Amino acid sequence: YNPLYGSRLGVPDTLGGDPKFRSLTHEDHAIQPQNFMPGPLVNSVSTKEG
């Protein structure tokens, strides 16, 4: 995405049965909507965590 602009897409802000959505800023980068998912991982842990 272009880092200078916010999304035209809102995301959930208040949860429950009647959720309220919030428009994204140009700075909540962690909750940028994605067009494509990452690939499959199966037990892909390090030797410390396996």
Q: Using CA atoms, how far apart are residues 49 and 41, in angstroms rounded to an integer?
A: 15
Sign of CA dihedral 41, 42, 44, 45: positive
| Structural method | cryo-EM
- B/e letters for 11-40, b = 16+ CB within 10 Å, e = fewer, are eeeeeeeeeeeeebeeeeeeeeeeeeeeee
Contact 10, 32 (CB under 8 A): no
How many Å is the maximal CA-CA distance in the chain?
Answer: 44
DSSP 4: T
DSSP 16: S
Q: Which two tokens stand for residue 50?
A: 């396996």
